[PDB]
Amino acid sequence: MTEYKLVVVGAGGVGKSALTIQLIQNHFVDEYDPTIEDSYRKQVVIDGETCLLDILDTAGQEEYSAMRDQYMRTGEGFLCVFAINNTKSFEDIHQYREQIKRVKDSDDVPMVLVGNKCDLAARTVESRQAQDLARSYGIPYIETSAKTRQGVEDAFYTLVREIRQH
Ligand SMILES: Nc1nc2c(ncn2[C@@H]2O[C@H](COP(=O)(O)OP(=O)(O)NP(=O)(O)O)[C@@H](O)[C@H]2O)c(=O)[nH]1
Ligand SMILES: [Mg+2]
Numbered sequence: 001m002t003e004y005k006l007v008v009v010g011a012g013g014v015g016k017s018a019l020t021i022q023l024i025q026n027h028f029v030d031e032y033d034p035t036i037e038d039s040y041r042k043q044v045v046i047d048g049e050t051c052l053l054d055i056l057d058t059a060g061q062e063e064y065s066a067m068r069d070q071y072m073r074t075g076e077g078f079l080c081v082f083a084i085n086n087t088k089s090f091e092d093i094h095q096y097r098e099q100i101k102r103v104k105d106s107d108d109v110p111m112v113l114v115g116n117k118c119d120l121a122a123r124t125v126e127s128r129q130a131q132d133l134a135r136s137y138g139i140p141y142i143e144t145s146a147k148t149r150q151g152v153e154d155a156f157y158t159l160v161r162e163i164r165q166h
Pocket of ligand 2: 016017018034035058
């Protein structure tokens with residue numbers, strides 16, 4: 001079994017916890033809406049390889065977290081999440097990417113740009129705009145809904161594949 005340390009980042013309210021919980025849930029607990037940053041585990045077979053995913057659901061930059069720097073040092077890949085109905089969350093992506101680059105001292109960190117809440121009609125960030133940004137970073141872009149589950153597994157598995165291909 002190969003272990004991957006994945007970190008989910010992005011602005012307050014974009015759906016970092018909803019995404020993490022949707023991936024990792026065993027559904028014994030009906031509703032789980034975490035209020036605090038935390039770490040979760042999921043075992044999954046990705047392309048024949050049994051993987052243990054350790055997933056850190058971080059708070060947005062506007063919340064204080066003592067361990068944030070060490071989180072980024074430990075993290076092997078990062079899901080950079082914004083919400084497709086929240087332009088500010090999209091503009092904020094630059095800040096998360098600069099923080100990771102500053103801490104890890106690298107331009108080549110495995111990452112996936114995630115445009116969450118794609119179930120919503122009230123879109124303010126066009127897919128093409130986010131594809132352009134992802135292209136500028138040299139990373140994949142994947143739209144998700146934590147409500148419908150669309151794209152959720154693909155986002156996390158794409159990140160694993162980026163780590164593996166690094
Ligand atoms: N329509 C829709 N709502 C979503 C989606 N993902 C999350 N939400 C909703 O958006 C809100 C924020 O979700 P949450 O998972 O707490 O986001 P967060 O990024 O972890 N927030 P925080 O930074 O404060 O921990 C909740 O009301 C949640 O139900 C999605 O894909 N679609
Ligand atoms: Mg959260």
